[PDB]
Every structure is written in structure tokens, then in C-alpha cells.
Symmetry: C4
């Protein structure tokens, strides 16, 4: 294999993973209209590069909720990574610790909070949480993440029930505690409200990011409840089909929060120019989901490291060709839809 | 067969029904531009879901012209159901009586008004009517529907002549009284005017819905003639080709009637998110045509029951993932085109 | 063969005509972008039909430059019809005389002005003219048309040179006096100006229509020079590629002439709904080019008669389903783009 | 071979050139979204031709930076032409000297400045320059071009680093001094700023054109630094992917420079109507890149001459069919997007 872009990693993963596993990772909800649009929407945003700006020394570094990272490109929560590679999340956190970027650990990981911390003691690590009907286990997760050096909580707010991913049902298809639709119907609480966010905000002094916000009014409510960021996300197009692409709703959310918290994006990031467009529209950083899994499927830690390095170099080139020597000068005039 | 969405039922029906019968049911008029657009138009309307609203107890119930139904998803008139299954309309009305929803019986049914009432005595049942050149038979139908417990009349107003469905002519292709184009040219009155609506309004005290309205001015005229609802319909794209999708004209019609009557939609409903979008734009309920026929072709009553249950569950999930605990809170901010 | 729409006639013509002849008739200029758009543009204009208007007695009749015709659907000039059938233009004029519509005779016909008049003595007949470098032959044509009972002159104004139709060059591919590109470079005058229109206007008292106008300013100039109509035409997309579809420029031209002359359309008419849309946007009538040739290729006079009857019946149905009992009530609210 | 349009030359070049060489010449950056759009964008601009203007004597001549040319169609810089044909740039400059148009010589030519001048002593010739980390060699190039009769400098400003063309990396793929990405990383200066433009402006009294401007603000800065033209260019879509098509950004640049300098376009010119549209939107002339290489691949000098003659004749026809007797009357009302 000669894999030189993120799409090559997906094509390789399709060739080596059982169909059920590949389809678990690549599927979106229902007719997958949002899955296609998360990528198509990036192509509609055009770049207006500045020339002659001196880009000899391109600095990709930024910060996420106060913590320095090497690039505005971080690993999003994807469940059950050991299905892709025997090391799963441990390989992922080692690759993040090599790159100098952060890993968001899924609540449905095939590795424990304490195992991951130990594989990546110097890695920037966050916990993605669901509020479970069992609030005792929810609180136990939060208190384990605090003790194991995790630096934030990403609370997923778009999953009262699991989305309907047809291939998991059509294909006859967790170390911390569709079969997956039935699992959620059991553990995950569909009653969660803003009252539960008030509880979580009182539970921990860790930064909390609301993950899965698509509306400006909900983003303002998150700010009002004392949360510290918004991850503009449609859950990799796996929840409600027919929502907009995240790059299309990002500007409304950035406008609505009036600078009070950091805004992040995930969904459809596959190229350095996607990262650049997201930052031009006001995201502080982006998270990648599927590309990391294809990295694992190729060669575990090394495969994840290669995916993250291809993204980093593509982003560096896009910054340089656009006239941007650092992330602080990536401005809204770089893009038009 | 493992049929888990409405498209699967169509694919199965194509596999088991003679081509002429399948094409009778699936065909639209002329080049079928509206047939494609009835579905494509739903995909252009995007959903803006609210998070954290408490959707543990999702209530799908609503009412149609005063009568309670279990969900805002009802069976539209499709002629000649016994071509799809030996029980035809009797299977359909039994499935509606199990689901707690309504059946609109076609005037060109392969079962009699009195036979259907008897198969579904507790089912909510309406009659779709044409005004026939023979007004005596027209009046006999209305007076049979009143005596047999039907709760409304859906008068079809878009069919002075039958549309030109090419496959019926190219394929060498009624218990109440193209060969079908020639049948209409004989029975159906092309002279029908608003004067005939005044006659029908005086004929019966049953609610009357005008079916096949596409213009706001015609919707206002229906209100002025004392009708009790508008079914925004292009007749499943089988009459005039090149009219807009019904989801696209729905907002104009809702605006034009100023709340005075209920507005319904049919045409292209195949998914729970289609139902949600129609309700967000002000429809009280939607009617499904073809999906019921594919249910019959699969397994008669059980097949219709399965189609209606897939629609119900998809709608429940779309409501929950959008933050809607009941139909009364499905609002216009949920959608944008 | 079972040919029930105009597209079927084209498919049959492709099956029976030598490739060079078929490609001569079906080709557009260069990459054929306008050829595709002449048809695609009709599909973008949507119909908003009125219900319940009494369409029992649909009257398709209208008039063209004062002369009654049975329908607003007339035969446009297409050169060299005997390549499609041994009777060529004589078959075409007999079919027009049966239908009660008009024939525009090409200046590059394979039959003489006096032969056509004689085959269709009761047919409504017009002459399409080019202003030839030889003004004596130009004047001889006009004076023959006047003597043989032709009722107008359609002067083609978009052809100073012939368009570049690639297949005629790639395929190694006139009774009144690319090899065809070379013929024009010889006979047709590229110097023609509005001064030449003044000459033609003084030459004959016959109505004169300017054929091939695409701009409102040129349409106003035609009115100022005392011409009696505008045929909005891109020459069947065979001249300048990348001009708009004729249905898209029709409203600008109708607006610009302020009712002073009749406006006609050709280019991409294949269905009754195309005729209806053109009339809703203010055309008095439309001309069909290629469909007549496919009629000839099928069965000469009978094939042309069948094409014209399919168009007539499709138009009658579209009028009836739109609520229009006659052409005088086809209004601009029937369409929206 | 029977090659009658520019696309035919590309298809022939694909048939005769090794895949690595063909892909070097035809590739764009990353997913090649801009490569497709450079051509698609021309098709969206529609032509509104004037009739009856007298186009018997069509004059294509114009001037570029003061020098007369036979047509507003000139040869752009494409590196390493000897890979396409044994004569490379010498064949190209001979074909330009036959046509009476200009050649822009690449800084990465497979022929020397003094060899090309000698093959085309009477040809209009310009030098495309990069500002190299080695300013001594940069100055040597400029002073050779001045001594050898070159009439301008086109300074490329969009290439601080080379774009990522995937096929050069996936295919295991200079007489004046991806392996090519690595070459640039060595010679080409990523620090170049407007200070370096001030240096180049003081270095030579030759006209200087800034090549690769996409923003109006950068075009105004070029005017302020005393440059004499802007070549609106995305480097044949080979640098930053996802920038707009050059025909789409051309009007902003023409507006921004307020007539102070000539504006040129390259990127996606393949047809005479492309040239016409560019001139209608205010370009003085256009440059062709790839089409010249396909000319070489076919038959060296004769192949380049044939490509340039097909462009000239297509442009002459498009001018004539649009009503334009010379370039001075090609106005903005000819086009609408
Ligand atoms: C296979 C898979 C598993 C996921 N598991 C989780 C999860 O456990 N928790 C969560 O909050 N999001 C989960 N997501 C959503 C991701 O965090 C993220 O929103 C999404 O992958 C981003 O889009 P992308 O895959 O296009 O980069 C998952 C996504 C995928 C594809
Ligand atoms: C096979 C078939 C038969 C139909 N028969 C009738 C009919 O008898 N009366 C009527 O008013 N509408 C009739 N319709 C129109 C339907 O009531 C309804 O408007 C349409 O099916 C809704 O679109 P859908 O099939 O996309 O759900 C028929 C539609 C189909 C597909
Ligand atoms: C084969 C062919 C020959 C034509 N010959 C002539 C001609 O002799 N004179 C003329 O004015 N227009 C000519 N035209 C243009 C037609 O009059 C008319 O504008 C065009 O066919 C209308 O478009 P349609 O073919 O899509 O119906 C010709 C078109 C075709 C396809
Ligand atoms: C094979 C190839 C080599 C090129 N080499 C150079 C170069 O050496 N210097 C430069 O400034 N531009 C270079 N360009 C960009 C061209 O000057 C020009 O901007 C582009 O080819 C125009 O687009 P077109 O190929 O669609 O006509 C190159 C383009 C191609 C395709
Ligand atoms: C369905 N994929 C995930 C997702 O998108 N969000 C989430 O919470 N997951 C946990 C999970 C769900 C089903 C089965 C096992 C684990 C996902 N894997
Ligand atoms: C043509 N399909 C129907 C329709 O769309 N509307 C209607 O009234 N029908 C009655 C019917 C028509 C033809 C032949 C038999 C019955 C339809 N089946
Ligand atoms: C090229 N087709 C025609 C057309 O569009 N307009 C016209 O005047 N024609 C005369 C003609 C042209 C070439 C060869 C023979 C005759 C056409 N046939
Ligand atoms: C990459 N193609 C070129 C281009 O677009 N711009 C440029 O300066 N080139 C010089 C060059 C680059 C790589 C290898 C050899 C020579 C190109 N050939």
C-alpha cells in the first residue's frame, strides 16, 4: 500500500476489515444525506488566498480550552476502536502523544479510562460522556477522568436515542462499566434536559463542551449553563439524517456565542483545506472521527500517526498557500460560500 | 426478505409483481419530473434539531378533522389494491384498524364501501370521491359512505382527465358501480367547477377535503365554499407533470388558509423525517400512497402493518432526535430550505 | 414500433437513419451546452395549475400574424428534409394542411417554393429567408413566395456564418437556386445589418418576423424597423453555443416589445407542457424543428402527422389539467422558475 | 488522427504520452475541485449575442503591454515542454512567431532563454519568473531576458511552496541554471513578500505582471507597487485546491484595478467562447497552458500551430456570431452568469 491522503486510508480499510465492521464505522443514518453533505459542503466554501505574505515559518500550534496543541486538528470520540486494531484506543493515544495533539476518548471505548491515561500519560486527553440513566456510573466516569488527568468533559447532547444506521441492521451486526441501537435504548437516558447539564456543571470543575449542537439558540443556552465550549457536530451524520453539514451551521453558532466560549467542528474533515475553512469561519479546532479508525485499520499506532501527519502537512500547505503564517491570522475573508 | 425501510418494500414489490402491475403503481405522468421531485424536495428541506428537551415519552397522537389517530400518518387512496394482494383494501383497512390510523378508500377500489366498513368496523375510514358525469351514482356513493360510518369525503379536484402515464400505454395495460385513461374519459366529468363543489357541500354534512390543490388562491376558494380541509397533492405526480413537489407548495397553502381549515400533504412520503418536515411546515397529517401498495405486495395486511409501523417508528425517532415530545411542539424553526 | 411521445420518434430515427444524417439533424454547436439547456430549461419552469375551471370543451385554436391555426404549434424551418424521407417537404406540408397548422419552409429546402405550394395549396405556409450576398436571388425568393401564397417571411438574423457542428466535420458529411459550413461561407452574407432589414421591409408588404433574436434591445430594434414579430430562437442551439435556452430569454423579449408584435419561440419543444409554459410566458405560438424530421424518418407525411397529433393531444391535456379552456386564458401565474 | 477541437488534442496526448508525463501535465492539486471548476465556470456564463452588426471583416488583433498580437490568445508558461516533444519550447516559440502571438517562457523550461530567443527572434516573448532563494540567479535570469529581447516579466506569486498533485506522488514521477515538490522546497523562496516585489520593480524597467492573483486587495497592492498588469490565475488549479475558477474572480479583479493596468486570465481556456467571455468581463487577453502541451505531444511546432489556429478560428466565429467586428466592441452586456 501507498496511502498518501485520507481517502486512500478509507479505501485500504474497506479492503482489510470485515464488511460489518467497515459498515459500522462508515455508516450514517437512514439515507445518509447528511453523511454526503458533511463532505460536499466543504467543497462549496471557496478559498480566497492572499499572496506574498512570508510563509517561511508556518506555525500550526494553537490551544484547546487552555491547553497547547501542535495543530488545530484533534482526535474525536469513535467507539470500539479495538474492532479496527488489537491495540485500539491505546494505539490512538500513543499517536496523539507523538503528534502533540489531543484525544477525545469515547464513553464506549474498548479500553478503560485508567488503561488509556497509562498508555498516554503525557498526551492531552479528554473524556466524551453520555448522561446514563444510571447517574452513579456517570459520576464514577467523571471522577475517574479527573483522577486520571483528563482535561475536559465533552458531553454528547444529540443522542437521546441512537440513530438508525441501516447497514448495522442489514449486516447481522466496552471496558468502562442493531445491538447498538438496543444497547442505547437500555443505558442512555432519553429524558436528559438542561437541568441535567446544571447537574453535570456542579459535578465537575473540568471544562465541559456541549457536543452535537446545531442551533444558535441551543449554543446560547449552553453558554448560559456555564459550559466552556460548543462542538458543532451532527455526530458524524449518524443521528438525525437531513440536518445540515457542520461547516454550514458553524458560522451561525460562532455568531450566537459572541466569543464567550471556544467553538469546535467535526463531521467531514478529510483534508487540510477543510481545517483551514473551519478556522476561517471561527472554529478554534476541528476533530476527526473516521480517518483515525482507518489509520488504526491500516497499522495501529503508526497508521493513526500517518493519518494525523498527512492532515498536519496538508493544513500547513493550505495555510502557506493562503498567506497564513500562524492560526491567529486565519480570517473570515479567506472563505466565501 | 429483510425489509427495514420503505424503499426495501418497493424493491421487493418490483421483484414479485408483474411489470404491468408494478409500473401501474410506480408510474408518474409523462417524463416523471414531478415524481422525482416529490422525493428530492424533501431532501432540500434541512432539519435544525433542538437538544436536551426530554423526549422519554414521545406521543405521536393527533387528530384528523376531529377524529383521534395514533400518528399523523394515514393511508391515501390508491385504486385497485387487489392487483397487489388477494385481500386488497380489506387487508389495508384491517392494518389501519390495528395501527389506530385512518384509511382513505379510493372510488376505484376492488372492494365495496360496505365490504371495507365490515372488514374494518372500528377503523377510521374516509371516502375519496370523484364527481362523475352521473351525479346519481356520485350521490349514491356519498350516501353509502355516510351510512357505513365513513367520517369524511376527500373530493379529488385535479383529475378532469387522467394524466398520461407512458408505461401503462407501453405495457399492454372496480367493485362500487391506457384502458384507465379511456375509463376516465367515459366516467369522470371534465366540466366540474366550483358550482359542483357547492352542490357536494349541500349534499352532505360530512367533512369535505379538497384533494389536489396546488395554489393558494384555489385553497382560499375551497375555504370560501365551506370545505373543511385541503390535501396538498399532485396526485402522486400522475396528473400534470412539471408541477412542484407538494412539500414545496405546502407553506404557500398553509399561509393562504390562515388557519381556517386543516392542511394535509401527500406525495413522496417515504421516511419519518418526511412526516416531521411536513408537520413543521404546518400540515396536520400526511397520507402515504405507494408505500401501502408495496406493503400489500409483500404480505397483505401484515405487509401494510409493517410499512405503517416502520413509518411510525421512523417518525418517533425523528421527533425524539429533534427535541419534540409530541406533535403540538413541532414548529416552523425545525426546518429551513 | 410503438411511438407514443416525441422522444420515441427520435430514438426510432436514430435506429433507421445513417449516422451522418441523424447527426446532421440532432447536432448542436461545439460542446452542445445550449442544446442540452433548451430542454433542461423547460423542466426548471414549474406549473401552478388551477382546479375546477370547466375544461370539457378545450379549444386549442389561435392565430399567427392574423391567420387562424388549429393549435399554437407550428412547423419550423429545417433544411434538406428529403434526407429523412423521399417526399421531404411535400410530406411535411401535407401533414400541416391535415392538422390545420402552418409550415415554415427553409431556404435550403430539397423542394421548390412552387412544388411545396402545390403539394399544400390550402396549408398555411411561410418562407424562412436568408439575406444572400446575391440580393437578386434573395428578391426572387420573396417574389416567388408572394406569388405562391406564402403569408409571411421569417428572416433568419443569427447566421452571418454557420455554427461549428463538430459531428458534421467528424462524420465525412437544394431545389430553390462541413460542406454546409463551406456552402454558407460562399452564399450567406456576413455583412447583413439593420440597413438590410430596411431594404427587406421596403421589398415586401408580407409580414416579416425576425428569427434568432436573443436580446431585448435587438427585439426593440426589430419593432422600430417595422417588423411584425420576433421568433425567439437560438437556431436549435446550432449557432453560438453557450447562449441561454429560448424559454429563459422569452420573458425579457416579451417585456421589451410591449405588445407591439407577436413573439414566438422555438428550441427544445418536445412536450405539450413545453407549449403551455411558452404561452404562459407570452409567446403566441411555438415552432418545432427536429421532432418533424423524426416524424419524416419514421413514415413521411403520416409520421409528421403523428408527431403533430401527439403534440396537439399533450397540449390539450396540459391545458385541461391546468384549468385552461382556451389559449386566451393561459396566464403568467401558471408558471414560476 | 482527425483533431478538430482542443479536447481532441488532449485525448490524443493521453493515447501517446507515458501515463506519468500525461498526469504531470493534466493534474491539479488534491481532489482537483478547482481543475474541474476552471472549465465548468465558463459554461455558467451565458452569451447574449447581438444580431445584424456587420461582421464581414472580423479583426482579432489587440495588444498586450503595448505590443501588437494577432489575437487575444497567448501561450502561458508550462514547464518542461521537451517531455511532450523533442523540440519542446523551440517548437512552441516557432508556432507563436507563425501565429503572431506571444509566448510566456517558464522559468523551469527544458530550453535556455538564449536558445528560445534564437529559435523565435521575431516572436513576442515574455519570461515567467520565480523569486528564488538565490537572488543572484533571479537577477541573472532578468538580465538575460532583457538582453535576449523578452518584453515583460511575469512574476509568479502563488507558489511559496508547490501544490500537492497526487498523481505525481502516486506515479513514481531545466536548461536555465513528487521530485518537483522537493525541487521547489529547495530553490523557491517561501519568504517572498511585497518587499521582494519592490526589489524586482527596481531591478528592471521591463513591464512586470503579477501572475496568480485571486483577490481584489492583492490586485490593488500590485498596482501600488508599480506593476503593469495582473494575470488572474490559480496556476492551472495546481496550487491551492478549492479556490474559485479564474473566470469567476476576474470581474472582482477588473473592478479593483480601476483600469490602471491590463488584466489577463488563464485557467480552463479551451474554446473560442471562453476567450470571448473573458474579454467581455474585461480581460485584455487570455493565456493557454495545457492545450499547447497537447499540441506538442501531437506534432511539435505543427501541433502547437494547429491548437492556436483552432482557438483563433473558434474565437473569430464566436465574435462574429455575437456581433463583434473587433475586440474593442466586446462589451460586458454580452455575458450574464
Ligand atoms: C464509528 C463511530 C463511532 C462513534 N462513537 C461515538 C461515541 O462513542 N460518542 C460520541 O459522542 N460520538 C461518537 N461518534 C461521533 C464522533 O465523535 C464524531 O462526531 C464524528 O465521527 C465526526 O465526523 P467524521 O467521522 O466525519 O470525522 C462516532 C462516530 C463514528 C464514525
Ligand atoms: C397506484 C395509484 C393509484 C391512485 N389512485 C387514486 C385514486 O383512485 N383516487 C385519487 O384521488 N388518488 C389516487 N391516487 C393518488 C393518491 O391518492 C396520492 O395522492 C398519492 O399516491 C400520494 O403520493 P405517494 O404515492 O408518493 O405516497 C393514486 C396513486 C397511485 C400511485
Ligand atoms: C436539421 C436542422 C436544420 C435547420 N435548418 C434551418 C434553416 O434552413 N433555416 C433556419 O432559419 N433555421 C434552421 N434551423 C433552425 C430551426 O428553424 C429551429 O430554430 C430549430 O430547429 C428549433 O429547435 P428544435 O429543433 O429543438 O425544435 C434548422 C435546425 C435543424 C435541427
Ligand atoms: C504542466 C504545467 C506546468 C506549469 N508550469 C508552470 C511554471 O513553470 N510557471 C508558472 O508560473 N506556471 C506554471 N504553470 C501554470 C500555467 O502558467 C497556467 O497558469 C495554467 O497552465 C493555465 O491553465 P490551463 O492549463 O487550464 O490553460 C504550469 C501549468 C501546467 C499545466
Ligand atoms: C453507533 N456508533 C456510535 C455512535 O455514533 N455513537 C455512540 O455512542 N456509539 C456507541 C455505540 C453504539 C452502538 C453500539 C456500540 C457502541 C457508537 N458506536
Ligand atoms: C391511474 N391511477 C390512478 C390514479 O392515479 N387516479 C385514479 O383515479 N385512478 C383510478 C383508475 C385509473 C385508471 C384505471 C383504473 C383506475 C388511478 N388508478
Ligand atoms: C446546418 N443546418 C442548418 C441550420 O441549422 N441552418 C441552415 O441554414 N441550414 C442550411 C444548411 C446548412 C449546411 C448545409 C446544408 C444546408 C442548416 N441545415
Ligand atoms: C508542477 N508543474 C508546474 C507548475 O505547475 N509550476 C511550476 O513552477 N512547475 C515547475 C516544476 C515543478 C515541479 C517539477 C518540475 C518543474 C511546474 N511543472
Amino acid at each position: 500500500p501507498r496511502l498518501i491522503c485520507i481517502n486512500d486510508y478509507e479505501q485500504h480499510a474497506k479492503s482489510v476489515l470485515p464488511k460489518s465492521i467497515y459498515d459500522y464505522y462508515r455508516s450514517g443514518a437512514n439515507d445518509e444525506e447528511t453523511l454526503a453533505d458533511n463532505i460536499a459542503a466543504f467543497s462549496r466554501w471557496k478559498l480566497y488566498p492572499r499572496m506574498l505574505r512570508n510563509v517561511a515559518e508556518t506555525d500550526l500550534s494553537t490551544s484547546v480550552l487552555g491547553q497547547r496543541v501542535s495543530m488545530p486538528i484533534c482526535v474525536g470520540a469513535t467507539a470500539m476502536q479495538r474492532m479496527a486494531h488489537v491495540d485500539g484506543e491505546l494505539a490512538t493515544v500513543r499517536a496523539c502523544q507523538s503528534l502533540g495533539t489531543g484525544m477525545m476518548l469515547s464513553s464506549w471505548a474498548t479500553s478503560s479510562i485508567e488503561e488509556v491515561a497509562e498508555a498516554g500519560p503525557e498526551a492531552l486527553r479528554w473524556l466524551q460522556l453520555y448522561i446514563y440513566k444510571d447517574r452513579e456510573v456517570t459520576k464514577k466516569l467523571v471522577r475517574q477522568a479527573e483522577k486520571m488527568g483528563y482535561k475536559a468533559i465533552f458531553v454528547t447532547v444529540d443522542t437521546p436515542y441512537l440513530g438508525n444506521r441501516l447497514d448495522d441492521v442489514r449486516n447481522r451486526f466496552m471496558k468502562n462499566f442493531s445491538g447498538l441501537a438496543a444497547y442505547v435504548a437500555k443505558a442512555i437516558d432519553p429524558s436528559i434536559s438542561w437541568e441535567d447539564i446544571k447537574w453535570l456543571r456542579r459535578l465537575t470543575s473540568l471544562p465541559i463542551v456541549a457536543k452535537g449542537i446545531l442551533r444558535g439558540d441551543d449554543a446560547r443556552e449552553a453558554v448560559k449553563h456555564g459550559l466552556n465550549g460548543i462542538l458543532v457536530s451532527n455526530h458524524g451524520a449518524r443521528q438525525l439524517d437531513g440536518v445540515p453539514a457542520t461547516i454550514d451551521v458553524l458560522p451561525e453558532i460562532v455568531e450566537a456565542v459572541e466569543g464567550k466560549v471556544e467553538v469546535f467542528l467535526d463531521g467531514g474533515v478529510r483534508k487540510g483545506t477543510d481545517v483551514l475553512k473551519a478556522l476561517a469561519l471561527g472554529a478554534k479546532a476541528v476533530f476527526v472521527g473516521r480517518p483515525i479508525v482507518w489509520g488504526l485499520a491500516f497499522q495501529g499506532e503508526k497508521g493513526v500517526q500517518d493519518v494525523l501527519e498527512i492532515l498536519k502537512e496538508e493544513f500547513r500547505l493550505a495555510m502557506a498557500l493562503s498567506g497564513c503564517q500562524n492560526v491567529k491570522v486565519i480570517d473570515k475573508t479567506l472563505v466565501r460560500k
